[PDB]
């Protein structure tokens, strides 16, 4: 599925309200990307599927922390 | 003339037989509904 | 019975079991030939069997 492995962002739903306000079902997808990150302590490249948001958060926290929360939540990376 | 039901056993059982139902979500819901109405036989079996 | 059988060893309970088996085979062989007057016997033996078996189990069980 399209799910951010970091922030847990998922597809959500909403509408097109047109100019005449005709409401129509739609979705908002997370913005997702398959990316290789450098883990120094493991000396290795982990590949996560993450949103832009996720990436930014990886910059802030460091990747060690993030992966610690991936083993904690118990989801495989 | 040639009518609509031309029977076959292997056909009958692959299409509606027990295992065929159990294969899927929907089928097990059929078998749920039947067990709930309390039929004598659920599926077509010999 | 069943106090009586309880005081016998496992071997003896296996010889009785084999004997009851013969007797029950014989009895239904009679009944099958329509020569059996008392049908009252079948039930007698058919149940005794169970008694024996139910002991064997608890002697192995504990």
């Amino acid at each position: 599925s399209r799910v951010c492995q970091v922030t847990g962002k998922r597809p959500v739903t909403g509408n097109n309200r047109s100019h005449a306000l005709n409401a129509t079902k739609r979705r908002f997808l997370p913005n997702l990307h398959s990316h290789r990150f450098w883990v120094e302590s493991e000396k290795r490249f982990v590949t996560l599927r993450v949103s832009a948001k996720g990436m930014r958060v990886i910059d802030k926290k460091g990747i060690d922390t993030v992966l610690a929360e991936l083993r904690a939540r118990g989801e495989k990376y | 003339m040639k009518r609509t039901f031309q029977p076959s056993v292997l056909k009958r059982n692959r299409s509606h037989g027990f295992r065929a139902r159990m294969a899927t979500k929907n089928g097990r819901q059929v078998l749920a509904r039947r067990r709930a109405k309390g039929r004598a036989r659920l599926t077509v079996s010999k | 019975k069943a106090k009586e059988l309880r005081e016998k060893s496992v071997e003896e309970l296996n010889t009785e079991l084999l004997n009851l088996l013969r007797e029950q085979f014989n009895l239904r062989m009679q009944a099958a030939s329509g020569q059996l007057q008392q049908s009252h016997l079948l039930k007698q033996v058919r149940r005794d069997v169970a008694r024996v078996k139910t002991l064997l189990n608890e002697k192995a069980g504990a």
Partner: protein
């Protein structure tokens, strides 16, 4: 094989004209046996219990008839028939 199983195989003598015919002419007896028993076990069981020599055991399965009792539709149980060939050697009798 175990003997305990054996004594559980053979239900009953089958009585009929065909039966009598084979018993007289071809030296063969006819048995109702447990639905699950096999040619091995029937060979064993006759040879053991009647203590006579079996040549070969042929079998078939009889589907019970369908009956009506008071409008109700029942089904008579299945069962298994065994033609049991004895060698010309033994003579089994009715007293």
């Amino acid at each position: 094989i175990r003997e305990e199983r054996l004594l559980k195989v053979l239900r009953a003598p089958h009585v009929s004209e065909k039966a009598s015919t084979a018993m007289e002419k071809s030296n063969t007896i006819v048995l109702k046996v447990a639905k699950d028993a096999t040619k091995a076990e029937i060979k064993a069981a006759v040879q053991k219990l009647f203590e006579v020599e079996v040549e070969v055991v042929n079998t078939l399965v009889v589907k019970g008839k369908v009956k009506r009792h008071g409008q109700r539709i029942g089904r008579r149980s299945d069962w298994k028939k065994a033609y049991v060939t004895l060698k010309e050697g033994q003579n089994l009798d009715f007293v």
